[PDB]
Coordinates of C-alpha atoms in Angstrom, one line a residue:
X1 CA 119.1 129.2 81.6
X2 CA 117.2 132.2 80.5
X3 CA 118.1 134.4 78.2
X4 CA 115.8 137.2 78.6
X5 CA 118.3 140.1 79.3
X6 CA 120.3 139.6 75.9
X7 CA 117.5 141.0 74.1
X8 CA 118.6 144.1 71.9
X9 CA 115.1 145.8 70.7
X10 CA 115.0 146.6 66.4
X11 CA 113.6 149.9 65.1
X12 CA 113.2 151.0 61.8
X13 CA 113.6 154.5 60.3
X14 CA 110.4 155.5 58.2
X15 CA 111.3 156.9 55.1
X16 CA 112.0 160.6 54.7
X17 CA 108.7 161.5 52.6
X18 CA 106.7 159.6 55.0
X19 CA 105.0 162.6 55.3
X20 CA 104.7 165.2 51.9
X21 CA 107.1 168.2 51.4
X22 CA 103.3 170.2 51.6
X23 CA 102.7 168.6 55.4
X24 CA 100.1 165.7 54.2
X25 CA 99.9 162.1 55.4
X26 CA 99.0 161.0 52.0
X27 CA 100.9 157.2 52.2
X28 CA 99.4 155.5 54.7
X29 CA 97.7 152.7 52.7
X30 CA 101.8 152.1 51.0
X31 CA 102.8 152.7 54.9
X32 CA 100.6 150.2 56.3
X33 CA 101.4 147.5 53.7
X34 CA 104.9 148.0 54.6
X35 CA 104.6 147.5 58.5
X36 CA 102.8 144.5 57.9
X37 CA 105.6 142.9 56.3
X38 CA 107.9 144.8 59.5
X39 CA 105.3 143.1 61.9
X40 CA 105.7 139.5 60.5
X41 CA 109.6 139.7 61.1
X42 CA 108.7 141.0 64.7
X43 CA 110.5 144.7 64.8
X44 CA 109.9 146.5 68.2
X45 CA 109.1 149.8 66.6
X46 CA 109.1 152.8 64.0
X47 CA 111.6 155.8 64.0
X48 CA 110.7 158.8 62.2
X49 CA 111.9 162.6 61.6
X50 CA 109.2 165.4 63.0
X51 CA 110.6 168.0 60.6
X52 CA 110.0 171.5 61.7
X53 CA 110.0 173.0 58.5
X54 CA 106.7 171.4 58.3
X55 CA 104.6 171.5 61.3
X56 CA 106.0 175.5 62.0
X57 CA 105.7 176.7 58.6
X58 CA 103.4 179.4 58.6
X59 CA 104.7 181.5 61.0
X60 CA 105.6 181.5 64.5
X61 CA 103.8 179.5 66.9
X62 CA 101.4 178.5 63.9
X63 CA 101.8 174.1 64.4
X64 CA 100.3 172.2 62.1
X65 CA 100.4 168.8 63.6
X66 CA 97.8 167.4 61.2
X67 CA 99.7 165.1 59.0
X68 CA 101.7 163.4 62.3
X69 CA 98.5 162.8 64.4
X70 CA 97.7 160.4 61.2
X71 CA 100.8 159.0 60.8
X72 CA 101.1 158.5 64.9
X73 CA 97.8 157.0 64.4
X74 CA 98.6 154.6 62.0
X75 CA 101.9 153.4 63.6
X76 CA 99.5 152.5 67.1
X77 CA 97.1 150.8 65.2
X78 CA 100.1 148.6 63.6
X79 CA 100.9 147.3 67.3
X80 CA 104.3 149.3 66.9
X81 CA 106.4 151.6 69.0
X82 CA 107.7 155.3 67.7
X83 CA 110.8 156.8 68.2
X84 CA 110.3 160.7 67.7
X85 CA 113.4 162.7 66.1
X86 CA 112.7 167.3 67.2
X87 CA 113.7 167.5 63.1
X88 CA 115.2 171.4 63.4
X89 CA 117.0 171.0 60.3
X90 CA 117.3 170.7 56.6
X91 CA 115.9 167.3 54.9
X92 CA 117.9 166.6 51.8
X93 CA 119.2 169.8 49.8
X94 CA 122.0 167.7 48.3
X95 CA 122.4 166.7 44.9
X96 CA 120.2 164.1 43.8
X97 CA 118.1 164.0 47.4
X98 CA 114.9 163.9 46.3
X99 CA 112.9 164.8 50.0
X100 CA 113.3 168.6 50.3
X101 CA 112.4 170.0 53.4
X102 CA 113.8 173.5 54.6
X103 CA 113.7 175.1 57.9
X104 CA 110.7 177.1 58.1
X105 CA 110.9 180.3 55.7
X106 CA 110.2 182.8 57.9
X107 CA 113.4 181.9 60.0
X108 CA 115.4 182.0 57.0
X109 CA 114.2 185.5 56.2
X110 CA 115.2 186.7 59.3
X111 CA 118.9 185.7 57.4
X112 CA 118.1 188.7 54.6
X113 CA 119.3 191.5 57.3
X114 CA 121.0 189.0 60.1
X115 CA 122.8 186.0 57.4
X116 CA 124.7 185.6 60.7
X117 CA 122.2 183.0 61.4
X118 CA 124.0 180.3 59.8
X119 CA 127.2 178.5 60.5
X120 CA 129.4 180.3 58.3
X121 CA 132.9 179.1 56.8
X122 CA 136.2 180.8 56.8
X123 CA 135.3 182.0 52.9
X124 CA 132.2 183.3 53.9
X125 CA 129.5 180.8 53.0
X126 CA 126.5 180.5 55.0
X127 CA 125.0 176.8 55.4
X128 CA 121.5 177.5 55.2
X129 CA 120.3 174.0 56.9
X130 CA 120.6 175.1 61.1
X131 CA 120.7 177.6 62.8
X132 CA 124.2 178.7 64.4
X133 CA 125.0 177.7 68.0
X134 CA 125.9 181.5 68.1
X135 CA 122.1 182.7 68.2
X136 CA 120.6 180.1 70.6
X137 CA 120.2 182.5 73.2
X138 CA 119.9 185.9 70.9
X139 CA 115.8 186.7 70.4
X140 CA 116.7 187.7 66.4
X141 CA 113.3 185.8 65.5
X142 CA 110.0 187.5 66.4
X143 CA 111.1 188.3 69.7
X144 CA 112.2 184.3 70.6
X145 CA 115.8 183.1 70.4
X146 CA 116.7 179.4 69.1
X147 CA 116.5 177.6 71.8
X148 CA 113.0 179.3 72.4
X149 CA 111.7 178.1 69.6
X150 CA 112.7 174.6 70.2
X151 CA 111.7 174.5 73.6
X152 CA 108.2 175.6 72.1
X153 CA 108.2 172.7 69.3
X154 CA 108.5 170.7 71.5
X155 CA 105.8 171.8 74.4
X156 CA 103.6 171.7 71.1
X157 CA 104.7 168.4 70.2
X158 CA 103.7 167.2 74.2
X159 CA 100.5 168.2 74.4
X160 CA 99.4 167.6 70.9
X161 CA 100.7 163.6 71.5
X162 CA 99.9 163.5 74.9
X163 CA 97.9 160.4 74.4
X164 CA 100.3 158.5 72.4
X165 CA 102.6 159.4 75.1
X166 CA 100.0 157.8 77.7
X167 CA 99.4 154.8 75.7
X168 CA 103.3 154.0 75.6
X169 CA 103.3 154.4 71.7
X170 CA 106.1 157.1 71.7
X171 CA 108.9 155.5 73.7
X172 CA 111.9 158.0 72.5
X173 CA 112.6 161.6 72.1
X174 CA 115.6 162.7 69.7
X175 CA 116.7 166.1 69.9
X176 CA 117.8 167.3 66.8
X177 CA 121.5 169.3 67.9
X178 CA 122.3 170.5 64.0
X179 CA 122.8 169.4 60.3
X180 CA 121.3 166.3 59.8
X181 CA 120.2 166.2 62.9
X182 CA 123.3 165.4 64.7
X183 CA 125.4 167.5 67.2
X184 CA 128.3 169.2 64.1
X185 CA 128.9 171.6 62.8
X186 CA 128.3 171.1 58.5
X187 CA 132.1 170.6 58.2
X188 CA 131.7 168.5 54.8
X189 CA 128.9 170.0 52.7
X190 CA 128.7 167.4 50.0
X191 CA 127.8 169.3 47.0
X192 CA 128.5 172.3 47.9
X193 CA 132.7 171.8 47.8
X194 CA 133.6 168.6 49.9
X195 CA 133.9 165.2 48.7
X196 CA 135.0 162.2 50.8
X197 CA 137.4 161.7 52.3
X198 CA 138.4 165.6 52.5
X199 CA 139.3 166.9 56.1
X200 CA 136.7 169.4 56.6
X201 CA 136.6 172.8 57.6
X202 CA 136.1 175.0 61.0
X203 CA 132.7 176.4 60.4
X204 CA 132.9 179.0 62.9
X205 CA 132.7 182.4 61.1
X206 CA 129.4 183.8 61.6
X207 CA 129.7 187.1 63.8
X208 CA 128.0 185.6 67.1
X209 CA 131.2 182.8 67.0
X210 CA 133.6 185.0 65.9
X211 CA 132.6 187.4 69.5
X212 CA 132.1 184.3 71.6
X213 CA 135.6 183.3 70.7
X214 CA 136.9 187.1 70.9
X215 CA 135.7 187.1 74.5
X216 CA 137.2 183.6 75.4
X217 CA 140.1 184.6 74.4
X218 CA 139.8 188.1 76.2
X219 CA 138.5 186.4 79.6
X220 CA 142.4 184.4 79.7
X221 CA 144.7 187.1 78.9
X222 CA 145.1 186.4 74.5
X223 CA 143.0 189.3 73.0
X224 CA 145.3 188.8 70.2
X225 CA 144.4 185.0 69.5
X226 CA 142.8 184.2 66.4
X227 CA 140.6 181.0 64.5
X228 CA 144.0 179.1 62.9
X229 CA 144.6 180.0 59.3
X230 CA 146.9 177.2 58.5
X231 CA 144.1 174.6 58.0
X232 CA 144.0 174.2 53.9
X233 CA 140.4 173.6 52.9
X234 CA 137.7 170.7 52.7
X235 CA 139.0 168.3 50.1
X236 CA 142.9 168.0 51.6
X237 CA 144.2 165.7 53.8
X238 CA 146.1 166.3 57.3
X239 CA 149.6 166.8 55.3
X240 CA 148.4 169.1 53.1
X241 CA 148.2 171.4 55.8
X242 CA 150.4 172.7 59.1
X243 CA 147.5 172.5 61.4
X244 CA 146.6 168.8 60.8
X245 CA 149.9 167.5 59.7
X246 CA 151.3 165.2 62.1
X247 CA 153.5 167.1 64.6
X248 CA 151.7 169.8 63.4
X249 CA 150.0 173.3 65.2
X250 CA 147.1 171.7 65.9
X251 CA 149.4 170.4 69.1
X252 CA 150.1 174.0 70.2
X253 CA 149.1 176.1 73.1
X254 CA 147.2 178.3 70.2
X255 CA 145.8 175.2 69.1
X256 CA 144.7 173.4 71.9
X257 CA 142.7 176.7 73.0
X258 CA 141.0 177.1 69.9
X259 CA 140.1 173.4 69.5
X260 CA 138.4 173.4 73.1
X261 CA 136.5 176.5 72.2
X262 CA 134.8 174.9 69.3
X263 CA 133.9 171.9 70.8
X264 CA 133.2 173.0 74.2
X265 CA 130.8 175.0 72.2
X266 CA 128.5 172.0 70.6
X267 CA 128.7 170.5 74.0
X268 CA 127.3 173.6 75.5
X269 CA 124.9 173.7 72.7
X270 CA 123.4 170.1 73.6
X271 CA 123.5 170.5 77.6
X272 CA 120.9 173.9 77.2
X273 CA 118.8 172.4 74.6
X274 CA 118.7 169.0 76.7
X275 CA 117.7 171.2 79.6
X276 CA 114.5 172.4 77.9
X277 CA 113.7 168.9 76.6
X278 CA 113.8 167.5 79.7
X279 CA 111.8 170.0 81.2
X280 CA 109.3 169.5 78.4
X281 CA 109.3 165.6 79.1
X282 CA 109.3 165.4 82.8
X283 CA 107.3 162.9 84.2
X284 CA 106.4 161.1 80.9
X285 CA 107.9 157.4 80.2
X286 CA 110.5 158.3 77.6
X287 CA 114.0 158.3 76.7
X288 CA 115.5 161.6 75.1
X289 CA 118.6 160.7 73.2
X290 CA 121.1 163.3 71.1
X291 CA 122.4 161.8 67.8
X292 CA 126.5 161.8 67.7
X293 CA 127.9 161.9 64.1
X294 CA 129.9 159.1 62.7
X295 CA 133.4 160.7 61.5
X296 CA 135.3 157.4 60.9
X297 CA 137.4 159.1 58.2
X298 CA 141.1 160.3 59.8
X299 CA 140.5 158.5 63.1
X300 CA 144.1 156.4 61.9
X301 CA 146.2 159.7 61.9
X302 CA 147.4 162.1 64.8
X303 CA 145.4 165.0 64.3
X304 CA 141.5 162.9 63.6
X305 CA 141.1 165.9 61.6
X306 CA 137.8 165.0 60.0
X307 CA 136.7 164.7 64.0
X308 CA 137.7 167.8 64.6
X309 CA 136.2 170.2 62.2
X310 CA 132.9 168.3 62.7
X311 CA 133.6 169.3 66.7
X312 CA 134.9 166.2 68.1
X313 CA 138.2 167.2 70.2
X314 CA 139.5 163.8 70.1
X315 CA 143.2 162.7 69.8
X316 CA 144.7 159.3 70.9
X317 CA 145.9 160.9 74.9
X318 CA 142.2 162.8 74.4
X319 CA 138.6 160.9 75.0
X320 CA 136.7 163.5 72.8
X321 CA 133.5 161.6 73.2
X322 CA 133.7 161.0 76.8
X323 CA 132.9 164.6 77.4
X324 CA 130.0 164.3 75.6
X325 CA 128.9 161.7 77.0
X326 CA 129.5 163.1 80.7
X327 CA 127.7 166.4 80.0
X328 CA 124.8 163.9 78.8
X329 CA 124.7 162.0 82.3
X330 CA 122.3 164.8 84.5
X331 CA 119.7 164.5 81.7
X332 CA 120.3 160.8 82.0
X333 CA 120.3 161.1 78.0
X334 CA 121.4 158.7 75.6
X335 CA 123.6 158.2 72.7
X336 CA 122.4 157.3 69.4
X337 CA 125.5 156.5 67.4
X338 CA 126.1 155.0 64.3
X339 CA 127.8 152.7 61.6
X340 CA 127.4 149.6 63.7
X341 CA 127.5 147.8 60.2
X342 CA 130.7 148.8 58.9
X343 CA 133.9 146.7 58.9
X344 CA 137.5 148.5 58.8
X345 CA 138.2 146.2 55.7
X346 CA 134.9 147.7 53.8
X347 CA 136.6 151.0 54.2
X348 CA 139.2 152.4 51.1
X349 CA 142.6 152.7 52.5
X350 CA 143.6 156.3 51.6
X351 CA 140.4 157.3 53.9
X352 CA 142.4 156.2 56.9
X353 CA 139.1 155.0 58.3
X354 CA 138.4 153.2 61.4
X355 CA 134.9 152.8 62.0
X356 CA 135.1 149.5 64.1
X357 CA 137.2 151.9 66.8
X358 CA 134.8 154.6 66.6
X359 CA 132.0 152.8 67.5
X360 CA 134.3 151.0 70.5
X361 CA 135.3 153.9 71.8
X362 CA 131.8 156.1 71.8
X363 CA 130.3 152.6 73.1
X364 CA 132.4 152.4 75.5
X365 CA 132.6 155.9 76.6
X366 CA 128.8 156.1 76.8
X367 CA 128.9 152.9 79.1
X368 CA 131.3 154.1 81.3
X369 CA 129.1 157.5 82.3
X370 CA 125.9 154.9 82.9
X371 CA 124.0 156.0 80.0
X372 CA 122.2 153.8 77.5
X373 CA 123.6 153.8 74.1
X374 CA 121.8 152.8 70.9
X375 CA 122.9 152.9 67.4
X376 CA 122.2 153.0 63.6
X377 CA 123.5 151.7 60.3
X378 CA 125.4 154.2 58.3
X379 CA 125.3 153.4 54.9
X380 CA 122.3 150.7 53.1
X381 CA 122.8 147.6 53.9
X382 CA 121.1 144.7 53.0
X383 CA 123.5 141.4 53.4
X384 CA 124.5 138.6 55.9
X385 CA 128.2 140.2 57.0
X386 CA 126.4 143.7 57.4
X387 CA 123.8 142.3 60.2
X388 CA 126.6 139.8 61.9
X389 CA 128.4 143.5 62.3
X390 CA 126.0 145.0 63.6
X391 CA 125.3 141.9 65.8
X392 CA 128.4 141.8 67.5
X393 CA 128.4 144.9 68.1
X394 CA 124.9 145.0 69.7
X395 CA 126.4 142.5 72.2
X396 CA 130.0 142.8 72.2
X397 CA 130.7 140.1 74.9
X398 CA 128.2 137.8 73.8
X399 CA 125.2 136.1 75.4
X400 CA 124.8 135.3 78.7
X401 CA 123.3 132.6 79.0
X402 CA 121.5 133.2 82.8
X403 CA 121.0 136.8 83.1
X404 CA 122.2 140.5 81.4
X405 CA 125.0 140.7 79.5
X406 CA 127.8 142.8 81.0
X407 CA 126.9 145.6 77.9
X408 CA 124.6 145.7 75.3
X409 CA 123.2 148.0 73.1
X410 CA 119.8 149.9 74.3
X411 CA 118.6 149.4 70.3
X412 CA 119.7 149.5 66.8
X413 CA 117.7 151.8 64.3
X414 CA 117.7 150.2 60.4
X415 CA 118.4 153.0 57.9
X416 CA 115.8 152.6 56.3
X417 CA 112.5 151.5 55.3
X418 CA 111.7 150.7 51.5
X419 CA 109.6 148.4 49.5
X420 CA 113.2 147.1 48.5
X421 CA 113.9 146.0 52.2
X422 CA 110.8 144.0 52.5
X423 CA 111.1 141.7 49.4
X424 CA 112.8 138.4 48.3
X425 CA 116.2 137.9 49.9
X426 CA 116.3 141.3 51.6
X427 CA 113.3 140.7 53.5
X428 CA 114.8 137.5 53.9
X429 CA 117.9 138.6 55.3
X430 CA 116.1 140.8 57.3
X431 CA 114.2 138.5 59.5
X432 CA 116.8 136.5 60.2
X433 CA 118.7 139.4 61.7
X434 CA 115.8 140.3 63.8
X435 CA 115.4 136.7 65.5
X436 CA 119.2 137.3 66.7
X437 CA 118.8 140.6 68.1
X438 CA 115.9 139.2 69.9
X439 CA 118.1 136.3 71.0
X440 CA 115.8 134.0 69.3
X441 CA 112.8 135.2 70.9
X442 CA 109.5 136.2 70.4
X443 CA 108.9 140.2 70.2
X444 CA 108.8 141.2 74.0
X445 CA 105.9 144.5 74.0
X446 CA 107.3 145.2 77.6
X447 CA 110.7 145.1 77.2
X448 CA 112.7 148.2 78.3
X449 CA 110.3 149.7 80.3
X450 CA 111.3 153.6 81.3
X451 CA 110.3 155.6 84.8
X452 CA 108.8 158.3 84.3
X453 CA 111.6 161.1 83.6
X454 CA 113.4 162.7 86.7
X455 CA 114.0 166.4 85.9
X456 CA 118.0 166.9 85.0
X457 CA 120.4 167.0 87.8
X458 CA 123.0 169.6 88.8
X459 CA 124.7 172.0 86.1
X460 CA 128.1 171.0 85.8
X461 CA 130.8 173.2 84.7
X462 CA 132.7 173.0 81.1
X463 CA 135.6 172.6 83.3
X464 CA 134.2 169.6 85.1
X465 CA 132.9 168.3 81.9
X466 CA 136.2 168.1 80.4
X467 CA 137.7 165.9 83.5
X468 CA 136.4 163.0 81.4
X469 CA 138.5 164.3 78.8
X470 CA 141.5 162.1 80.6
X471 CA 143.1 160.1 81.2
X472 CA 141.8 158.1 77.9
X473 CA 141.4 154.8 78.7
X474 CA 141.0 151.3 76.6
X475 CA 137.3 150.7 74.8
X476 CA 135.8 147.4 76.5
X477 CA 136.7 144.2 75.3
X478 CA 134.4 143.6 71.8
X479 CA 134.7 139.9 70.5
X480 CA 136.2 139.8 66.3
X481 CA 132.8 138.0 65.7
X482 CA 129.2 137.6 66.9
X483 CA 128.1 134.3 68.7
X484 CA 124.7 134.5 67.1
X485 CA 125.6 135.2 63.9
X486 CA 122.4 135.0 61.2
X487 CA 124.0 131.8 59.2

């Protein structure tokens, strides 16, 4: 018996003002404190957003890494591993968010002539959290396109960390791919006219997108193929509509073009992006990782219409994670996913949410390209039934009790650090779940060790990225409940 290779390693995200809206480390005593208490219940590490809005803020080129060399600092000196997020978006913004970070201002006022910038929806509003997909490779900023600019955050980043990179402190790389972070389009501004469980919209519109799709549509023979206009608006639901309804347009020649296109493009997006960052990287002992959105909302109906205005193409005869994850194999990239906490029966019913699925089939998919796969908590969670979730799903066949497990996941991430977490029956709770992750062991400082990184393999083709597309095959066996639950 040993049960070393069960061993699923806990991270936990640092809050979002860990460092000040004004690019000061001014929390470390409160920060310390914390990871004390995070140190006695024996987490593997920290995870943290690097927000660009910060450290480029004064112009181009102009870092300020200040405020992170502290906080980098401190985290080493707490015995803990970091998990760095490329933060190239928006913090907060939304109603009652009380962390507001914007991308750097003089990117947005490059929007003032171009507003083209932004994702744009069919009405016209800009999203002023990302830059478009559309301008990755147009040099509208100071001479530099997008991707330049991210590709020189993060040569910045290297060579300003270089020696917590040496000293194995940072462990993990997250690209930042759009809103939030994650690889979408902004499909469901809250607050500014989307409120769960609405569908969505295409957010497509900006000029850039509108000529990328003109010229797709040009290059096979249909100059005359538009965006669809029969998709209602963010706050309906698939029958509202005679795109999503079932048996609906979103099934048609017109359709299935058009649906491609849009999420072809995010998968694009993420394969020049992960290019750079692994060129960046090369030779250092780290993982990079994308972060997939969790769009559990629709997944029970035909169309997955949430899925799809985010820019997931995926229908029950369609795998529209698979691709993703096959693009994400010459990086050797992984998946950070999410809602390993949630239960279909926590879900309202009229939300046609199937979250336990989701997380199968991205799982799944991941595993089946060879890439590691980690995941997060969706929503706050601080109770028993929440960490048995996430449990199984860490291990969905269980332990073995002489060797590795046939899957696992690569790590969970805790959303997110507070003073509530780490007191009374939270904390608690808390501890518990970490012991079972570990598999009842100690903390393991040289678990998961990573080569150094090999540079990306071979380009592939969109069209050989999308043989993963089918045929759509069944997620791996996941057991109804973990075998080492917390009790």
């Amino acid at each position: 018996v040993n049960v070393k290779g069960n061993y699923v390693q806990v991270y936990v995200m640092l809050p979002l003002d860990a460092v000040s809206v004004n690019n000061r480390f001014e929390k470390g005593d409160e920060l310390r404190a914390q990871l004390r208490k995070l140190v006695e219940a024996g987490v593997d590490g920290v995870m943290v957003d690097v927000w660009w809005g910060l450290v480029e803020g004064k112009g181009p080129k102009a870092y300020d890494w200040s405020a992170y060399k502290q906080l980098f600092e401190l985290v080493q000196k707490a015995g803990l591993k970091l998990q760095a997020i490329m933060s190239f978006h928006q913090c907060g913004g939304n109603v009652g968010d009380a962390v507001n970070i914007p991308i750097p201002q003089w990117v947005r006022d490059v929007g003032t002539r171009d507003p083209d910038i932004f994702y744009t929806d069919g009405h016209g509003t800009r999203n002023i959290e990302y830059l478009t997909l559309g301008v990755d490779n147009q040099p509208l900023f100071h001479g530099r396109s997008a991707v330049q600019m991210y590709a020189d955050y993060m040569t910045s980043f290297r060579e300003n960390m270089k020696e917590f990179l040496d000293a194995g402190v940072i462990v993990d790389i997250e690209v930042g791919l759009g809103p939030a972070g994650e690889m979408r389009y902004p499909s469901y501004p809250q607050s500014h006219g989307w409120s769960f469980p609405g569908i969505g919209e295409f957010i497509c519109y900006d000029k850039y997108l509108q000529a990328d799709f003109k010229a797709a549509a040009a290059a096979v023979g249909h100059p005359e193929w538009e965006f669809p206009n029969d998709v209602g608006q963010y706050n309906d639901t698939p029958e509202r509509t005679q795109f999503f309804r079932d048996n609906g347009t979103y099934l048609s020649e017109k359709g299935r073009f058009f649906l491609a296109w849009y999420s072809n493009n995010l998968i694009k997006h993420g394969d020049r992006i992960l290019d750079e960052a692994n060129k960046v990287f090369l030779g250092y002992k780290v993982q990079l990782a994308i972060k997939i959105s969790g769009i559990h909302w629709w997944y029970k109906v035909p169309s997955h219409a949430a899925e799809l205005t985010a820019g997931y193409y995926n229908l029950h005869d369609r795998d529209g994670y698979r691709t993703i994850a096959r693009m994400l194999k010459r990086h050797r990239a992984s998946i950070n996913f999410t809602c390993a906490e949630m239960r279909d029966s926590e879900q309202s019913s009229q939300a046609m949410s199937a979250p336990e699925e989701l997380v199968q089939q991205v799982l799944s998919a991941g595993w089946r390209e060879g890439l590691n796969v980690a995941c997060e908590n969706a929503l706050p969670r601080y109770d028993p039934t929440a960490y048995n979730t996430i449990l199984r799903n860490a291990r969905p066949h269980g332990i073995n009790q002489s060797g590795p497990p046939e899957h696992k996941l690569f790590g969970f991430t805790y959303l997110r650090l507070s003073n509530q977490l780490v007191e009374g029956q939270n904390y608690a709770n808390f501890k518990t779940f970490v012991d079972r992750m570990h598999a009842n062991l100690p903390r393991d400082p040289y678990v998961d060790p990573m080569a150094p990184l090999p540079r990306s393999g071979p380009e592939i083709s969109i069209e050989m990225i999308l043989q993963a597309a089918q045929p759509k095959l069944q997620p791996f066996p996941f057991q109804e409940h973990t075998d080492l639950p917390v009790g």
